[PDB]
Each structure stands twice: as C-alpha cells, then as structure tokens.
C-alpha cells in the first residue's frame, strides 16, 4: 500500500498535536478531585468518568500521525504503569510538557541532541534526588501502613496485606479472591507463579484486570510446539464433558491450532487458553515437570513417545484457580499431593548438593523457591456483595503499590515530590546552552503534575506551587483537604518506583519525539 | 490495460523525487547515532526504528514513476546486501548521491552517455584504491578480531566463529542454532549445503531470517519433473501422520503440484518446502544419490520405474534441520549411517583417479567436499531467552561479515574508506568535459556516507570530513565517541566486498536513470 | 454496443499521436547503445530495459483511435519479426518515419493514393537495390562465420550451425535441447516437421520462444474433427496416469473439446495440446500416416468404423520431444522402429514411379524428403545451468539469423544497409508531383534507423549519416565502437531478409494509414 511520509517539521506539527488532544484529554482528570470526562459509548448511555487511564484507553485520531503520536505517549505511559502499578495519567501529563517546549525548542532553530541530552541529565539527577528523598519501607508496621493509606484508610486491609508478606516473604506470590462470609481470610497454598503470559488477548475473561481468570481447571502440560487442531481434538471434547475450562502449558501454540482456540472461546463453545512454559532448552523440561508434580499431571513429550491423541482426562493436571496476565500466569491450589511434592523438593534439594557451577546453584533454588514456597490467597469478606467486590479491587491496588514500596520507597504524593527534586536542582548546568534549554525545559515539566492538581481543584496553581517549593522534604500541599503539610504524615504518598518510572517514561518518549526526523504510515 | 507513458525530462525528474523520497527517509537512520523514523503499523503502537533497512521496506509511493523511481533504488540496494550482509542503506545514501547530480546534469543539457561513463570510470579507479587499502584478513587472530568486532565487541563470538572455520574450513559450511544451556557449543556433523532457494517465498516461516526452518523432517528424493498432486498424496498423508515437516527435493515442482503445496503449508494442514535438486544433467543424478547416502534416503527416478505413489515412509531421508535462503539450502545432521557415507567417499575418491579431463575433476572434489567436509554447527547459549534469541542473530550477523572478510579483506567503517579513495583519485579526468562531469559527480558522491554519518549526529560534517581527507590510510573518525584514530584499531571497520557492492550497485543504478529515456505504468 | 466513429482527418491524427506513443518509447532503445526504459510491474520493483520487442509489448493507450493507430503498427511490426527473427523495433521506426510525413502531407492537401503508390514505388526500387547490395553467404566457411557474428564472437556456437547444415542440409530441420554435459553434441534423429501451429495461445508453456514444449509425450492420430470432449474421456485418463503429456493430432479441434483442454492445462491437470493435421483432403490422411508410422502410432479414422473411446494407450504414439510454434509443429525422435520407417520409404519411393502428373511428384518427394531426412539436434553443453540455459538462447538466435542469410544473403547492420539503397535511387520519379512527394517521403524515412541508432549514442546523426552516405557497398558507422569500416568485415550484418521485411511491412502499414478514411471503436 501506498505510504504517507511526512518530514522534519511536519512530522513533528503532526506528532504535536496528536499529544496535545491525548493529553488534553486525560489531564483534567489527575487531581483526587478531577473534571469528568464524558466517553460515548453506542447501545445506553454514555459513560461519565474521573479516570484517566479509561480516558485514555478511548483515544485514537483521525489523522494519522496526529494518532501515531498520541499513541506514542499512550504506549510508553501505559508501560510506566506496568511496572509499578499507577502513574499513567502522571506519565502523560509530563510527557506532554517536555513535548510541547522540547519541540517548540526544535522548532525555533535549535539543537535536537543537545535538547535530549539536556532533558536527560535533568531527568538522571532528579532521579537520584529522588532515591534521597525516597523513604525506606521495610518493616511489618510500615508495609501495613502503606498498605492502609493505600487502600484509603482501612486499617484491615493494610493488616492483612502485611500478613501475606508476613507469611510468605515479601518476593513470594500474593492473589485475592472473592471472600465468602463476612471474614476476611487469608490462607497458604500449594501453589506456583511463572513468567509467561497469554497467547492471544483474546482469551481475556475478565478485561477489568485485562487478564484471564479460570476456575477448577484442567491443566495441559505438553513439551512440544503445538500447531495442528488435529492432535487436541481427543483432549478438547473429553473436556467439554467435564463441563470445565482448560489450561494449555506447551513449549509453545503456533497459529494454526491458537487461532482455533481462540475463535473456539469467543463463541464460548470451550472456555480455554494457552501460554508458553517457563524458561528454555533444559530447564524448561525440568520446570514443566515441576508444574506437573504441583497439579498432578503427566508431561506429554514426544521423547518417550507419547502423542496427545492418545491422551485421557486423567494424564492432565488440576488446581482449583488460575490467573494470567499480559506476561504472568500463576497456579493456585494444584490437587498434586504432597507425597509427591514434598519428594519432588527432595530431589531439587540434592541437586544443589552436586551443583558445580553457581549458575546451576541459583537455577534450582529458584525451582525450590516456586515449589515449595506456595502462594497466598487472600479472601476478602464485607457484608453486600456491592461492598465486596468493591473492597476486593481496592485491596487488589494497595497490593500493588505496597509491592513497589517494598522495593524502593515511598515519597510525597501530590506530584509534589516531583516539584520538590526540580527545585532542588536549579543549577544544574550542560555545554551547550541549547542543552541548558534541555534542562530547563525538563525541569519546569515537573512541576507539570502539581500545578495540574492544584487547577483541577480551582485553585490558583502559581501560588500553590510557589509555596510548597519554599519549604523541605516532603512538606506539600494536600489538594483533597486544600491544606499544607507532611504530605506522608496526612497520607497522601507515591511509591518511589511509580513516581520514577512516571518520570523515566515521560522522558524516553519525549527524547525519541525531539529526534524524529520522518514519519510514514498509511494513505488516508 | 491502458498505460501511462512518460518521456524523457518528466520520466527522470519522476523518477527522481521518488527516489529523494526513499533516501531522505532511509538516510536519516545511517550512524551509529542514527535519528529515530517512526513506522506506523495497523493494529497497537507505532513502530520507532532506527533501522534502514526496515524504513526502506515500508516506503511505496502514490504517484507511479515517483514509485518505480524509488522501487528501482531499493531493487538494487537491497542486492547489495544479499551479496555481504549490509550496505543496504550506504547503497541508498550513494545512489542518491549520483542520482541527484547526475540527473541534474542531464537535464542541465549534457551528455547523458558521457555522464556515465564518467561515473563508471571513477567507481573502476575507487575500486582498485579499495582493494589497496583493504587490509587482508587471513589468520585465525584476524578471523576472531573481524567476527568480535562485528559481534560487537564480543569475544566469545569472535572466538566461535574462528574456531568453526578452523574446524570445517573457511570455505565450510557453518549454520547457528538455538543453544540449550548457558554454554556455547560447536559440534562437527554429517551435512551438506547447495546453491537452491525455495521455490516460493510462502514456505517461510521465520520472516526474521527470511528462510524455511524445519525440525526433525523427512526428505522426499525424487528425479522428476513434479506438476501433479496425485502422486504426492500417498506420501503427504503417511507424512501429516508422522507429525513431522517434509522436504521436496525433486528435479523441479510446477504450477499445479506448487500452488498445492503452497496453499497447504498456509493453512497450516501439513508443514511442506520444496527445492530444484542441484546443478543440472548427469552431475545431478549423480549429486541428488549423494543427498540419498547422507540422509538414508532412496532416490525415486523414472528410470527403474519408480512411482511417487509407491513410496512408504521407510523410502525418504531424514535430518535433525534444515534451512532453506532465497537461494541456499543447508541440510543439518542426516540420519545416514557412516557405513553408506563413508563407503560412497571411497566411490568417488576413485572417480577422481580414472578423470581424464580437468573438468570432470573439480566437478568430483567438488562433491567429495560437501559429503566428507560435513557441517559446523554452532548453538549459542545464554542466560535468559531473550538474551539468547538475540545474541543467536548477532552470532549470524558477524558469521557473515566475517566470511565477507575473508573473502575480500577489511577497511575504515565509517564511510572513511569511500571518502580515502575519493580524495585519492582527484586528478582523474576523461575525454569528453562532460565526461569530467560525470567523475567529478561520482567522486563528491563518494563523501555523502560520512557526511550523513557526521550530521546524524549533529556535528559539523564540513568539518569532520574535511579533517579525515587530511590524513592518510585508515584514519578517520568515528562518529560513536567523537575521536578521531586509526578506524579499524578502533573496531570501526566495514568489509571489504560490501563497501565495493555498496559502491557498485549505487553506481549501477544512477547509470540505468541518466541513461532512461521513457517510463511505462499503469493509469491512475 | 453504441460505437463511436470518426471521420477522415480526425481518424488520422488520432491514429498519428498513437503511433507517436508506441514509436517514441520503442525507439529509444535501438541502438547496440539504446537507451533505458523503465516499465513498471505490479507485486515489486519494475524493469529496466533496452529491448524494444519488450517495450512494445507493454504499449496500449487509453484513448482508443489512439490505441488502434499503436496497435495496427505493432501488428504489423512484429510480423516482420514472425519472418525474420529480428526487426520489429526497425520495422516501428520506419513505419513511424512514413506516417509522420506521409499523414502530414495528406493533410497538407496532397492526394493519398499518390503519396501511396510513391511510397511503394520507392520501396519496391529499394528493395531491388537491397538484393544488390545482399553479400551472398552460401558456404560452410560464411554459415559458420554468421552463426558466430550472431552468437556474438563464438566460433563454437557457428561451427555446431554450420555443422547441422552440414548434416541435414540447408534446408534441414534443425533444433536446439538442454545439454547434459560441458560437451556440446549434435546427433541426427528419426523425425519431422509441418506447418501447423497450436489451436490457443494458451497451451504456451514457455512464453520466452512463446512456444509448447512437451517431453516424453503420448501422440494422438486422429483423422476427424473433434468437438465433444466426451470421446477424449477414456485416453486424456489413461495418459495422466502414465503421468506424460499428449498432443493431439486430428483434423481440427472444436470449440467445446478445444475450450476444455484450454481450461484442463491452465490448472495443469494434465499437460495437453493440439494441433491441426497437415495438408488438405487427400494428401492429408496419407501424411497422417507418415506421422503414425515415425511415432509407432496407429491413425484412429472414421472410415473404418474406430472411435476415440476405443483406444488405449497403445494405439498412441510416442517421441521424446514436441515443439510447436504460432505455425510450427516439429516432433523429435519417435519410437516409430526403422523397420516399419524404411518399409514406408520404400513404399512412397515407389509412388513416384507410377505418378503420371509433376504436382503428384513433388506431393511424393515432399513427404519422403519430410519423413526420411530427419532432424538435426544440437545439445548444448556448458559448466553451469545458468550459463548453459542462456548459450542455448543464444544458439537458437543465431540458428535463426544463420537460416536467414542462407536464403537472401546478409547487408550492413547499422541500418547502414538502408541509407545506401536510399542515397542510390535520389532520381527516382513518378507522374503526380503528388507521387514525387511520395517517393521524398520513403526514402527520407529509411535514414531513420541509422540517425536513430547514432542519436541513442549521442553522436550527431546528420554528420554521422552524411558521411555514410558519401561512401559505397557496405562501407558504414558502426556506433557501438564509433568507427567507419566496412560494415560486413567489423561483423555488424543484418540478414537481407530482415532488412527487406522490416521495409516492407513498414510500408504497408503506413500506406494503409494515409488511406484510411475511418475509423470505428467502442464507446469510452
């Protein structure tokens, strides 16, 4: 097909007001008391919403490049939210204000490169100011804590998440489940997480997590590339019996055969799906038994010669949940009995004993690790179902953000964080001054957030800004209450990896954007 | 169909915006600090790349003319990398270079014959003063040098790539698979590899590569023409059953039995490929046993009155791999027993004895060479699959570089080499003033690589280029650090073949436009 | 359909700018120097090429007038070539020469039918002049020498042409297979050939001689026209099983049998083609014989009460190849046994003692001279098939010049020949001063293709021709190496033939034109 290509200028015209509307669009929502946004929707009513991330989700332009960069920023932004667990709206308001001054820099004669490097030498010393600023979270009473301010003040909630790393480490495998009585539960399990993620976004059940959630499954574990339908035909009809989902764990689904089960769970004819097992080459045979023994299944591989036509209900493993995500499958409960298990941890244990090599250490106190360790599932009960299903996803984010807390800190919440390390490095200087621009424009992008809280509520933002940058640390202003304090103290707090990765992201995206030179995409 | 023709002036200045079109899109990414094009693509995120190669594939022109001019360019740079393994864009950036002033020439009223012949002679002296500079590669030091500074400084590559030409050759056939643990293998194995591409490009399967990769397949030998399915379908059915892929290689397959085939292996029914078996007439009966013996195998000619439909699973070959180019195939680990291998070398070591003629000598050692001499395989191992899947591609990205060395030498990376050869011949001249022209273009064209390079990264290129001429050798600057030194100490170096293909095929190309006269399309 | 029609001067100058078109582009590329065209194609890059037969393929304008006035010249034109082997570019250039002044002058207020009849008053005198001029090449030392100059500097191919001549005679059928070895061989063969062509352009296997090329095929004799596909059913089944193609024989192929074959070798079903048989009425049923008996088949005739449905395979005949052309069918080396073959000469030999009429005589001598003399075979050999599947195309070119010069001689190659004869009839006059116009008309347009050949170079064409002009017999430029000589000695011939033709079908065609008076097409 015939191309569009823009050039220099133009392109960047282009990109720039595709992110100008992206971002117009999803800033007004950012404060705790942000403007709505109505989002059309055809059949019923239109949908009325505070909430950035489902503002965003909805944006697409119509002329091409003007899309391409607002899809830009939206791609980067929504991935600073996949590692942390927020930040998206906070991403793209900054993006949007190094991007307009950035490329308003380019575009009055200045140096593309040295912009970026500027910008990024901001960027890299206010990321380290904000590691000093950063408070640690390491023990019971501060994971509660966060866990708590978290989940809006809810003692109960911050309790329980505490419990989990309690009991099971602060790296080992949390879910949430929906509670049955009024009790909160929390309860250990034989159980398993892994690093591979669905096979299509099609299998998706559940698309408020975005992810696919499976109930007393059956598990497939077959050690071999499976593209033709021909060979699950006997499996896939004696499943459909049983009335249950269907977990396929195989080296790998190739088009064929995943096509099929995709359009095959769009009718709904068998609920399934399918993800590549854990690791490669040799360990990866090694740690698909491993899920074996846990679900008590049988491993299908072609080297001692077993087909999967010749396959019963009985050779598959079983557990009684499964959750996968973008890149995340993880087991709960597997039926595999602990005669097995435990034996099987048995073995592992030894083979640390021969290990020759550290590489080989690691490697199988890893699999000990996973096996053994189990996951923890965390019941929420609440006394209407309104109530609970509600409370479930509120522990469902505290989880989250507890997690990037854990790893590196928390620290003033209200964007002001943000202001606090930008005034903090007001000198900082380049070779160039086009570099110095850089700087300057990287800079004056942090008090993006701040200033765009404090307007969403109305108030003066200028004034606002002016006075939580004259004081220290993580003094600030809280908008909710329209008062100054410790922004920790009156809980209004972001991890230090959100707040960062918010910042990184905004910059990569807005570094690319000042470097582009050409542009090519479809004839309208 | 009613055509569009174009004449003369308006012919080539067509031709030539669509080909400023091209190089200013594919240009901009030259350096190592290349600029960013953003690639839009259907469904999710654009795509942002840095890459020339990628940027080339994606251009296509509305206007036709504009089109061809800008499709004639990428025909012929693109060959410049099938005949190397790079140069792709330096291809574009040079014909651009000819092609801008060239055609202004033409059109400016000169001689367009002599313009050429110009050019040509100043590419044939440029050649030469290649050749003089080229630093030849020889050793196992310089073999191991070349591949780790392809790899990107990587030793361990480097090392492999000149331990496998040290076991199987230079001249060897060396291919690379997926490594299994943390450790890089080089195992030595029965195989073999001859001058046949596939016979559609719809076989393919791993678009990366561009080829056919199969696993554990059958291969059917048969010495026929093959235009009719129905004596396949006896075969094809006992080979679905076996789940494993198969391999034609028959004299030729036509129309009806190939459009089959290619329709099959779509829909993913039965994983097939075929290839023309190698060379032609009496070598090739003879040739298609020897791929027999390697692989167990039994050749199916009409000439004892063999059927394809009487031909058993227990009939075809066998392997562990095997990997099919645009014009390669490459069998890996045949199942033949060293018994039949090793008793038919002792065959035809003596045909070697009762050669009369010189002829029918080479054309013997010649299949002594690719049975006896068997194939390196080199698996690359790595930490995580990630980090392995890639460092694989850049193992196959210095293995061909390399074997590009070793063929024609080593020279000054950052188009130094072009721009050392040009301020060399200066004095050249010719008959015809316009004839000057024509080298004088040619020569100027010879700084654009550099001069990109330099710009890219937002120097002075004026500058930089100028202090380059003023050395000698290999001298020049590399653009990644700012320093300048002796490029090819620096680990800045191009092999020799793909400077000179570079250079040729840019030649070639802006030759056939000054020297067009009339352009024929379609209608609007 | 509502047509549209045009009258007198508007059919006419519609008619011009159509040959315009159709010239302008095919004459660029004349010369051993021509020029590039580009013709766009559509899945990847287009084509350069030198090669007017090419180009003109690829001609057809939109507005019809304007079309038919290019394809009536590219009919015609390439006619010339169907007799020759060569000229169709000449053949436009020249025709484009006449039209231009001719349709001019009528326009200018002259009468056609003079300015006609001028033109072929000048022709037929020109072309007198040619056979003048015409170098006789009769010997083996002069078939050799142009069997070479038209290989292009290869003895070897001029003495493998020479040498069949030898064998078979001049007038000998000759044809050229795939060679096996490096060697080249030329065996004699039982075999045959007659003037028929094949019933649809579709049965065309290898577009490249536009030919039908069959191997190891079964031969069908049938004496009756075949309409119904229905008395095929029982033979076309029995011989895709023995898995060969068939050519088919009979008096004529109808429609309905016609139409299904078509569609049954253009999904390749089965490889199948048919001509009519030779000859008319009597001698034909007889010379259908000739054919069975060559081929070892037996003649199903409806004069004894056979059917096609009652026939197996081994009623068929059988060769182990088939050649045919727009109008020639040529069948090598039939299985028909020397016993039977000699038996029939010898019952033939004796029909021309009891002929008591000449035509009943030579009817005789024809067949025997057909079936008895055999065909001539030249393998060629060479060291790769890429090399070797050329110098057979070569060979094939200059068996075709060689047959040519054989029969009226050959003459200075730079359309050198043309401005002789043209320089030499300057008197010539006729009775209108209309008809003189005529004459001025033709014989100013024979300079065209040497001015032409020169301007594709570059050189100034008025001084070039000038002084060709000045001199006598052969003496021309030769523009490839842009010295004056001796056109025959530097190896620069046409054979007289082309020349002649190529003259002449211009002539026509132009003729036709400055008498047309109108023309009718479809409605836009």
Redesign the interface.
Known sequence: ?????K?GND?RVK?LRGVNVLADAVKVTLGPKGRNVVLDKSFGAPTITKDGVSVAREIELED?FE??GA??V??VASKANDAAGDGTTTATVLAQAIITEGLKAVAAGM????LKRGIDKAVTAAVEELKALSVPCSDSKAIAQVGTISANSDETVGKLIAEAMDKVGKEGVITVEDGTGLQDELDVVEGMQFDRGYLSPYFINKPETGAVELESPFILLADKKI??IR?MLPVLEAVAKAGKPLLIIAEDV???ALATLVVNTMRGIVKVAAVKAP????RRKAMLQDIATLTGGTVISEEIGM?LEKATLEDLGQAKRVVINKDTTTIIDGVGEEAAIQGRVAQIRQQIEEATSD?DREKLQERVAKLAGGVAVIKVGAATEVEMKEKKARVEDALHATRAAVEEGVVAGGGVALIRVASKLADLRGQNEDQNVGIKVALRAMEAPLRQIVLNCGEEPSVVANTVKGGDGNYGYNAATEEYGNMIDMGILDPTKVTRSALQYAASVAG?MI?????????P
């Not at 140096?111 to 040295?114: A, E, I, Q």
């Not at 470097?515 to 004839?523: G, I, P, R």
């Open positions: 097909a015939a191309k569009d290509v050039f392109a990109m091409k899309n391409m899809q830009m939206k791609e140096n593309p490169m040295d593209s033709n060979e190739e088009g064929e690791g490669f080459g040799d087909e590489y690319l470097t582009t030179e050409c542009m090519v995409t479809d004839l």
